[PDB]
Design a protein around this ligand. Structure first.
Ligand SMILES: O=C(O)/C=C/C(=O)O
Ligand SMILES: O=C(O)/C=C/C(=O)O
Ligand SMILES: O=C(O)/C=C/C(=O)O
Ligand SMILES: O=C(O)/C=C/C(=O)O
Ligand SMILES: [Cl-]
Ligand SMILES: [Cl-]
Ligand SMILES: [Cl-]
Ligand SMILES: [Cl-]
Ligand SMILES: [Cl-]
Ligand SMILES: [Cl-]
Ligand SMILES: [Cl-]
Ligand SMILES: [Cl-]
Ligand SMILES: [Cl-]
Ligand SMILES: [Cl-]
Ligand SMILES: [Cl-]
Ligand SMILES: [Cl-]
Lengths: 466, 466, 466, 466
């Protein structure tokens, strides 16, 4: 009553009477109880499956292999799923065995049952629309599933880049706010030469801007797809025109410029695109983490630190230390970046585990990439909104570090040479006397020329000799 | 109406009127929206915080620092949390900035507000029970929080070892079922010498049994705790007798044999125990993955593989290939193992990121360890129940591999020497003739002696020559 | 006597009297005794330093900043180093502190002392040619050193791709050798559908061919260089026209199409190019390892394995098992691939450790990438010469696997539907009767049609329905 | 003339006429040209092989299986190798295929040929002492080789711990030098509460002291050995008393307390001990790296940093910035630590690649562990001798940070409560007035009590309330 009985290769099984999924999905629900992450939590992934199934059905219809009415109803069911309906009917664990077969069959069963309803039949009456013979016609998991992954990740990358662009813009705006803050550059954490905080924050923006092209060019690799490979890449049970026509139909339906891999036998076990895209995310996370490490260091203080900048105060720092406020927003970003790096290692193991004509470890690989994308979007939005936008500088503290530095002696090299500048630098360190006073003390340069050479505003760019 | 107004260092903030948490927890909820994993999902972690707060209050009372009535009501509130109540009042993200302060203050606020109710006051009337001055008395996040992590992970390790032991026993029972199945060992995937499946499956059990002592001895490192360190390990604001007395009280309350670190300045930034415990989980996951790789290989077939064993058939293998059934249960375990390995790298980055008197990256480190423990328990239960318990062998296929192998010639080395055995082996490979027939043709041993040495049952143990 | 005395900021120090390096190189020799890997072992790295110093000197002269005669002798010294002379004068550890300053100063000292000789002076008479004021004029380590790394790695990538392409061609030739070997595809290690070994080995070639563009496009990122950044990217002490002119001169001198980074402040701490290039090497190593895993599996045997292929026999397999021969060449490649993956993690830690205006961890990062390139070239040559070129197939063994398989039932789906094909497949497994015989016993298809559908030669490509 | 011809399963091959190795070693030299790291570079590894062969021969003699004269001469040859002779006769690459067979046969061939000379025969006259039938009697590579690895790593761990202990003592001595340097603790890089630099450097010593037990207890796992396993753990061809007797003889000969694994089938593919030992090295490297990061931060300066400590000046910091000196010794240690972490990932991949009755990836696993041991010993020696021993503090700079801090307000909590302390802290930050002056201004505590509570020397330990 509350169930219907379905059957497959394994035998008979009860399915909830109103479920749009069928017996093979039910088995996968039962078999893989690993995580709290399920396909229903990934709307772009479900949408991509619906794109794939709509394209395959349209191609089968155009090639004379699928009845016009069944195609019409598969397309309507796919349109509904694309529009956001029935996603609760996709309940399997993102960490699952079977190499994606359980997700492909989940799509086949849900679409078949909705198409049956549109034909005036009841769920489970697969004699009128078969998950295998109609919704999966001319397909395998081993092309439909990776093609769905690739379109989903291509689309998710668009959203990752969008949040990255907003973060970049936040750094550029803050660089303009801070453009007149002269401060001391540091290399190896030792005093170097002067710079502006505008230069430093524009450098944050510009190194992150480089990641746009890295993320986009590697996500473009996902557009090479293998529809028509069927089981292992030979195209067994596909029509000679199907691979090209299905790929063209899929490009039009999805709006992604998918193209057909030139060797489908090569493509079917190929996980390289996922590896290098995960690596591009790792590269960006390494840069983001470094930037956050810099921010926590420059905000150190208030009395025993560098104290060049102030981060927005978002919560009390300490249960015991009164008045303390900690850089909690860069800290949570660092932690996300470490998770991304670890997830990238998971991807590497999964990719290296492929065997012969298929890699069966793509579920955890996809789960890890999608988790990294989600966490990175959230970390970047948090960093932008609750930290970068409201940063201020301690301008006088920074300027006094420059005025009292020895490193400005570097600007004298073109005039007195490195040996003589070193003599001045050593004496400044040993005695505490200023570089400026020592140069005049030793009568190395006129005051008029020295005033130009040691002006901090004159050390921010290359210049001809004064 | 639906809110009350609380205040902290940052300012005033609305808090849901019936929440047991307070302003600092609310800020953390607002500040860290990263993941779908929250403290409320980790009962052992919440319970450990309640142990710590009950022990600290009891110690403060015994030292004359805390009123008897406030101690009594803190204790009652902690007892309720230990018993499983009010866990929904702990809603912050497991990936959070602030180095744990938001979890410590969440415990301080919830316990204070419950103690206030027991005193006949209203939530937020902190003048009668202060989150900082009473519930956090003599403490910092920087001892209460890592002590809670360590007790929680020590207790979660017990559950991990319990599920591992059930899996070990499943392998032992299956080894007994298969004890008479003689088969070919393989090294470097080349034919080696005979063995039994009893030997092979007991070896699975025995290598996993070795992980019990590794997990337990590394989890024992968590018992070294730092109560009394307060902010950085100096014990500022603690009574001289507090560190020893609080640790003793915590051992009695928690039932874990916690001991006091001999150098609290050393202990406060120390993440080494988490690193090596995570590594012990990684080692066990590597072993589990290798075993699952073996099972998928020995189950290969049915007509073009090794086909030594049959795994329970848990779902149809293929949307296109009829009759195919895949080793989906070992596959999902492999994937969990890869996730554990990646999470262990996240732990390594977090640990290496410590600075001076504190490591602020413990939230994601703990999140990753707890995720690995949960996934491993689920993977081991799944492997046991849906695969190991029901394995069968193809006994005649295995025996015929032994009888037809060349590698059994190895058993003749003590009688005819390696050069002569090599001559037999080369001729067997080149001609397709059997080792047995070739030895008799060359008349290197009597038929009666050869019948003994090359009997499959006599090639499984050391033996005396005759 | 056998020494000369030189001095620097630290003080006076003995240098071997005939060494071309000077005091700062001697200090680095003394300070960093870590590994057996020294700069003298990396000719492309030394050559790149000479390119950089020649280009900088040419530019300084073209800007009127360096005497034409001193430029001429610096150029001659650089030409000698480029031609392969004096590489023993570069003896520092590849794992060294100082962020590359010790390598930059080694180049400055060697070139100065050779220029001094060409001018009729003695080594160490730096008053006539200064390592700092002449050979390092307008430069810092922080542009000369990464520019040298990037040119060296760009050139080393050419050699890596060259050896990869030889290996690819070896797979293509072997694919043609084996084009008529029909065999069983396998997914999830279960029998799938037929393919040819030509298809499988061409897929090996084609997946590796995809790595050419990945390695090349990521190595092209090295061409963005930062000459003119000087200490931190501000261009302090450089002429305004120097950065563009030096980059153009460097492109002409090196033959590499280097271009000037648009933000030198961004570029100076930027390690992203190394991270993603190392990741591209990792991706290729993961593919190579998978292919080697496949070869070891397909070569398993001779009597208890798959035994589809024979690898050239390169040494006795066993000290105890007579006649055994193991897949030692794929095995050593696997091991190199694991080393590449580990070295890639070292690169990731080094990159994430950058601080403010410089990343000081580039020596071990460069050491690790260069070690991976060298090991991979050796592994690929070994795999090609001692394995791939001589592979043969066991043609009858493979053909009989196809003839006796159940998986050919897949070809019936378009004619009888998946339900009926499943019934046939299950009966074939349960009874051992052939798929062909069962189809006729069920009167599903005529013999004439069945003979065409189930011909394995008709399963290797898509085709219209018979 | 300059060659002799030897024979094996593959065929005949020339060997250098005076080489103690034989044909199978020559093949391995020819087959594996990967790295510049050869067995001859690892004396403890060669020594361990000689222990193993001497113990096996003595046991075979005691069991009546080996002639007394052959045993005597094998023992003498092993003694010479143990004493350091003939190590140049072990020339194979540490990265090699064949799973260790090439190293086992190298030992068999060298020992056989030296035994032949002691018997008055010529090299290669194996009819009087057979590498396979005598020197390898009752053995496989698959017990002799891992037993040699395990004894070698057990002995190398002793040297690693020795160098760690020297470094620990260097930190303890320096802590005593700095015991009176009061300074500001920092958490999350924000001002925390006071400590002494003696506390901080003793914490360095004490956290490293914890690594001694981790390294030793994990190296003790190597003492479980598998002599008597022969090919796969079944003991085929061994006498039933051999495994126990050989292990006892090996313990006496080697001086290492080896014990017999209780399940030799389990032990033969078991790589878990290597994984967790490498993880213990990784944990120590993570701690060492953190300490070095701390040192580089505390040494930042001289005018724009924290400048708490001075590191010995070991070389000029910069080719351009005069007077600059960088923390190059902690930097090189950081880089070694990153290399150790990457090598640990190589170990993990190698371990997870085991298949059925053997793991063939142990050569690169062992190569990576031995590289990490060597690099870590050199890094620790360098850190001790060229940095820690000569550190000094800037005592007045540190004391003024404490005196001018706001964080000392924490000490007021037991007297005025956290809310009142927060009011003082916020007013100090906003106005720049001192915590001390504000407390007296607001008349919160008497000057007599305040002079005690806020004395820096009274904040370094727990105390009873003043
Ligand atoms: O919440 C605390 O007690 C400590 C915080 C910190 O170290 O900043
Ligand atoms: O579900 C499929 O179409 C394929 C599965 C497999 O390769 O076993
Ligand atoms: O060399 C041996 O004794 C074993 C080798 C193998 O397992 O093939
Ligand atoms: O050697 C240089 O030019 C720079 C060194 C530094 O950044 O300290
Ligand atoms: Cl999604
Ligand atoms: Cl540094
Ligand atoms: Cl997302
Ligand atoms: Cl929990
Ligand atoms: Cl192998
Ligand atoms: Cl759990
Ligand atoms: Cl080179
Ligand atoms: Cl599989
Ligand atoms: Cl090279
Ligand atoms: Cl050694
Ligand atoms: Cl921080
Ligand atoms: Cl060593």
């Amino acid at each position: 009553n509350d169930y219907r009985i379905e059957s497959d290769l394994i035998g008979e099984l009860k399915v909830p009477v109103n479920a749009y999924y069928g017996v093979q999905t039910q088995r996968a629900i039962d078999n893989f109880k690993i995580s709290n992450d399920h396909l229903s939590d990934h709307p772009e992934f479900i949408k991509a499956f619906a794109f794939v199934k709509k394209a395959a059905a349209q191609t089968n219809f155009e090639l004379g292999l699928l009845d016009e009415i069944i195609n019409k109803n598969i397309a309507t069911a796919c349109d509904e799923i694309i529009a956001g309906k029935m996603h609760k009917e996709f309940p399997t664990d993102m960490i699952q065995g079977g190499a994606g077969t359980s997700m492909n069959m989940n799509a086949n069963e849900v679409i078949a049952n909705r198409a049956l309803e549109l034909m005036g039949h009841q769920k489970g009456e697969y004699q009128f629309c078969s998950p295998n013979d109609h919704v999966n016609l001319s397909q395998s998991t081993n092309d439909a599933y990776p093609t769905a992954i690739r379109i989903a990740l291509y689309n998710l990358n668009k959203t990752l880049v969008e949040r990255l662009e907003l973060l970049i813009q936040s750094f550029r705006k803050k660089a303009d706010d801070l453009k007149d803050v002269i401060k001391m550059g540091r290399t190896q954490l030792q005093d170097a030469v002067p710079m502006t905080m505008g230069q430093e924050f524009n450098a944050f923006a510009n190194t992150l801007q480089e990641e746009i092209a890295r993320l986009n060019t590697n996500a473009d690799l996902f557009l090479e797809t293998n529809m028509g490979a069927t089981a292992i890449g030979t195209g067994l049970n596909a029509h000679p025109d199907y691979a090209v026509k299905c790929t063209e139909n899929l490009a039009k339906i999805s709006g992604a410029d998918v193209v057909l891999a030139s060797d489908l036998v090569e493509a079917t076990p190929d996980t390289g695109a996922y590896v290098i895209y995960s690596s591009a995310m790792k590269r960006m996370a390494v840069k983001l983490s470094k930037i956050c490490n810099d921010l926590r260091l420059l905000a150190s203080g208030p009395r025993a630190g560098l104290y060049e900048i102030n981060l927005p105060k978002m919560q009390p720092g300490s249960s015991i230390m009164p008045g303390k406020v900690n850089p909690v927003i860069p800290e949570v970003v660092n932690q996300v970046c470490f998770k991304v790096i670890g997830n990238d290692l998971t991807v590497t193991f999964a990719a290296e585990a492929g065997q012969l004509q298929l890699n069966v470890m793509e579920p955890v690989l996809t789960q890890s990439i999608m988790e990294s994308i989600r966490f990175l979007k959230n970390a970047m939005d948090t960093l932008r909104e609750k930290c970068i936008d409201g940063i201020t500088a301690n301008k006088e503290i920074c300027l006094n570090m420059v005025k009292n530095s020895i490193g400005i002696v570097t600007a004298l090299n073109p005039y007195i040479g490195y040996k003589n500048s070193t003599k001045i630098a050593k004496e400044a360190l040993d005695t505490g006397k200023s570089v400026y006073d020592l140069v005049l003390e030793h009568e190395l340069l006129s005051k008029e020329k020295l005033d130009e050479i040691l002006a901090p505003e004159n050390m921010l760019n290359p210049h001809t000799k004064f």
